Amino acid sequence: HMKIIGNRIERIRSEHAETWFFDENHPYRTWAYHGSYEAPLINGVVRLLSKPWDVVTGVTGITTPYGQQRVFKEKVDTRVPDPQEGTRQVMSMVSSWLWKELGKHKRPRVCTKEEFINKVRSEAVNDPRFWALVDKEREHHLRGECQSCVYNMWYMWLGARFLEFEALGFLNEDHWMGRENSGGGVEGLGLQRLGYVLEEMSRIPGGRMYADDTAGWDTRISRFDLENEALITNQMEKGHRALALAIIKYTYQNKVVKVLRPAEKGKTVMDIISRQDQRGSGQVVTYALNTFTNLVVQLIRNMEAEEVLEMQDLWLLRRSEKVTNWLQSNGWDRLKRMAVSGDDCVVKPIDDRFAHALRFLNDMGKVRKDTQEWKPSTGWDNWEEVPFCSHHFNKLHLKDGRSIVVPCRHQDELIGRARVSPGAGWSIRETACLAKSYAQMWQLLYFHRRDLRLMANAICSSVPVDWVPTGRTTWSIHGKGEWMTTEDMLVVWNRVWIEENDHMEDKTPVTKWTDIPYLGKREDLWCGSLIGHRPRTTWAENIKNTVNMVRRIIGDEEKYMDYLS
């Protein structure tokens, strides 16, 4: 490990030699500590148009070394015992099988510089020097060394991210975890489709639907998980394999991290730590690898439930042919009984033995959130109540009687995130264009929420019609950004929910917003609506005044549209 992280530690120790020191009283328990050195937000438009939520802490409650240290000590400075050898044998077998299924109709490839550039443009990438540094680190990797692939507690230098993209980006670009290729994956599906996936699963004969969340998934990715994820390199030709093995072994299996920590009299230090497991969040293929390993975990849980695996198999896997047979016979059926998106999963097992199939799950360190370790899981009878990707999904009916299945979540989080501006010296223009992005996203996905349809229409009425939406409104890969457009949102709504919606049999267009339904009031309120409560009523009654205010701020000379009418 030390020989692997060596030149990175040296490269930092020398960039910072005059302030470099070793803190004997550092707080790191499960990370290797190597030394330290000395170290150095509201969207106004949305806020002006969402006054009732100024006093809603669920909304308003949404950098400092003092915080990073706290979250590090409680979340990341932890360790889990190794799984037993039999458990590890099962993990390796299932991983090998799954990789071979995923690669049956797809071949790994190197992703290109121009792919990365084009993906970025949707100008460090248009400096030759950047690519000189990149080529440089690359030849280091090809020689068997790493100088500069270091995490900031988990952001990374754009060059390192390009090398990762080059070696493993194919998993994303060629949709290895798409539902067609993986059975249980959902990569490429939007929030406008996931609900249909859950409904489909609800129809499969079997037990309840289970959606257990793992407590701190990324922190419970083991070195064995990483080794099993690395098995994809066996499907690569040798050069590609060299690049990928470099990325995995020097960046995944042996990571170096810089993290901030408070010092004396307002001063700040940077600590350099390292370890050999856990997932570095926010890497290029973090999502794909999380999806992979979660699929493996659920397959194993099903095998325990169905009594293919027994207690004795934890210590040492006796006859492994039973595992191979179960995978070849039932593997794909079980995969199609899953919806897995990174660390999130829903499973429809063949019966409810799944609920108490916990031995391998717990031995793998994948302990369930908010539950006693050996308390059986509780599943759902009603697919519309199942949590998945921070949402639940409801069937609603258009005025003409056709049904749609829509994404829903507690409203406070949506409004709270829309109020956040990532910039600083952000003009009214960038602020307004971001507000417009949120509004149009709500029009596409959360139109069925009264407060959000109203607020979105006010925002869209307060921003010049020709201003193009900018910024990002979600980190979920299932928010596909169809709303990032100046195209009319009813047209976009039709394309998303009718035209290109395979679960919409009748392709008759919807020609007005009033034909598009809300949740029932009970449901709207349950999920955080303020309909009926006085500040919200006042807000709605005054909304045109407020819109005119924002218009006067941005400029009365601009062209505005009335989406409130």
Binding residue numbers for Zn(2+): 137, 141, 146, 149, 392, 408, 527
Q: How far apart are the C-alpha atoms of 260 and 206, rounded to whole Å?
A: 49
Question: Minimum distance from CB of 150 to Zn ion (Å)?
Answer: 8
Q: Does the footprint of Zn ion cover residue 194 (CB under 5 A)?
A: no
Residues with Cβ within 8 Å of residue 458, at least 6 apart in sequence: 49, 543, 546, 547, 563, 564
Helices 543-554 and 450-462: angle between axes, nearest 10 degrees = 30
Binding region for Zn ion (CB under 5 A) out of 88-96, 147-155, 275-283, 336-344: 147-155
Q: 379-391 burial, b if ≥16 CB within 10 A, otherwise e?
A: bbeebbebebbeb
Question: Minimum distance from CB of 159 to Zn ion (Å)?
Answer: 9
State which residue, 1 or 507, has the beta carbon closest to Zn ion. Answer: 1
Tokens 């400092």 — which residue? 64
The pair of three-digit structure tokens given for residue 401, joined into one six-digit string: 């009687």
Give the DSSP H/E element, type plus range, for residue 535. Answer: helix 534-541
Binding region for Zn ion (CB under 5 A) out of 68-76, 135-143, 215-223, 538-546: 135-143
Binding region for Zn ion (CB under 5 A) out of 16-24, 139-147, 260-268, 353-361: 139-147
State which residue, 91 or 134, has the beta carbon closest to Zn ion. Answer: 134
Binding region for Zn ion (CB under 5 A) out of 120-128, 144-152, 172-180, 499-507: 144-152
Question: Minimum distance from CB of 392 to Zn ion (Å)?
Answer: 6
Return the DSSP state at 328: H
Residue ranges with strand state E in 326-451: 338-341, 344-347, 392-397, 403-408
Question: Minimum distance from CB of 408 to Zn ion (Å)?
Answer: 3
Q: Are strands 268-275 and 403-408 parallel, antiparallel or unpaired?
A: unpaired
* Residue 178 near residue 185 (C-beta atoms within 8 A): yes
State which residue, 149 or 441, has the beta carbon closest to Zn ion. Answer: 149
Q: How far apart are the C-alpha atoms of 241 and 237, rounded to whole Å?
A: 6
* Residue 66 near residue 72 (C-beta atoms within 8 A): no
Question: Minimum distance from CB of 139 to Zn ion (Å)?
Answer: 11
Q: How many contiguous H segments (helices) and E segments (strands) does the chain have?
A: 23, 9
* Residue 430 near residue 423 (C-beta atoms within 8 A): yes
Binding region for Zn ion (CB under 5 A) out of 129-137, 263-271, 308-316, 345-353: 129-137
Binder of Zn ion out of 230, 327, 452, 527 (CB under 5 A) = 527
Residue list for the binding site:
137, 141, 146, 149, 392, 408, 527
Question: Minimum distance from CB of 242 to Zn ion (Å)?
Answer: 13
Q: Which of residues 396-415 bind Zn ion (CB under 5 A)?
A: 408
Distance of CA 29 to the CA centre of its chain: 28
Q: How far apart are the C-alpha atoms of 535 and 54, rounded to whole Å?
A: 10
State which residue, 296 or 444, has the beta carbon closest to Zn ion. Answer: 444
Binding region for Zn ion (CB under 5 A) out of 188-196, 275-283, 521-529, 549-557: 521-529
State which residue, 137 or 166, has the beta carbon closest to Zn ion. Answer: 137
Give the closest residue to 94 by CA, choosing from 349, 236, 292: 292
Q: Does the footprint of Zn ion cover residue 149 (CB under 5 A)?
A: yes
Q: Which of residues 264-283 bind Zn ion (CB under 5 A)?
A: none
State which residue, 364 or 527, has the beta carbon closest to Zn ion. Answer: 527
The pair of three-digit structure tokens given for residue 20, joined into one six-digit string: 């470099």
Pattern 360-399, Zn ion, x by CB under 5 A: ----------------------------------------
Question: Minimum distance from CB of 426 to Zn ion (Å)?
Answer: 31
State which residue, 137 or 187, has the beta carbon closest to Zn ion. Answer: 137
Binding region for Zn ion (CB under 5 A) out of 96-104, 148-156, 187-195, 447-455: 148-156
Residues with Cβ within 8 Å of residue 479, at least 6 apart in sequence: 190, 191, 441, 445, 473
State which residue, 139 or 558, has the beta carbon closest to Zn ion. Answer: 139
Return the DSSP state at 24: T
State which residue, 53 or 217, has the beta carbon closest to Zn ion. Answer: 53
State which residue, 62 or 525, has the beta carbon closest to Zn ion. Answer: 525
Q: Which of residues 285-324 bind Zn ion (CB under 5 A)?
A: none
Q: How far apart are the C-alpha atoms of 165 and 115, rounded to whole Å?
A: 9
Question: Minimum distance from CB of 248 to Zn ion (Å)?
Answer: 11
Binding region for Zn ion (CB under 5 A) out of 104-112, 134-142, 277-285, 475-483: 134-142
Q: Does the footprint of Zn ion cover residue 171 (CB under 5 A)?
A: no
* Residue 382 near residue 392 (C-beta atoms within 8 A): no
Question: Minimum distance from CB of 47 to Zn ion (Å)?
Answer: 24
Question: Minimum distance from CB of 138 to Zn ion (Å)?
Answer: 8
Question: Minimum distance from CB of 136 to Zn ion (Å)?
Answer: 10
Q: Is the dihedral of CA 180, 181, 185, 186 positive or negative?
A: negative
Give the DSSP H/E element, type plus range, for residue 257. Answer: strand 255-262
* Residue 75 near residue 369 (C-beta atoms within 8 A): no
State which residue, 137 or 451, has the beta carbon closest to Zn ion. Answer: 137
Residues with Cβ within 8 Å of residue 64, at least 6 apart in sequence: none
| Strands lying side by side in the sheet with 268-275 | 32-39, 268-275, 255-262, 151-152, 155-156
Question: Minimum distance from CB of 305 to Zn ion (Å)?
Answer: 30
Binding region for Zn ion (CB under 5 A) out of 180-188, 286-294, 340-348, 525-533: 525-533
Q: Does the footprint of Zn ion cover residue 244 (CB under 5 A)?
A: no
State which residue, 140 or 179, has the beta carbon closest to Zn ion. Answer: 140
Q: How far apart are the C-alpha atoms of 52 and 18, rounded to whole Å?
A: 53
# residues contacting Zn ion (CB under 5 A): 5
Q: Does the footprint of Zn ion cover residue 146 (CB under 5 A)?
A: yes
Positions in the binding site for Zn ion (CB under 5 A) = 137, 146, 149, 408, 527
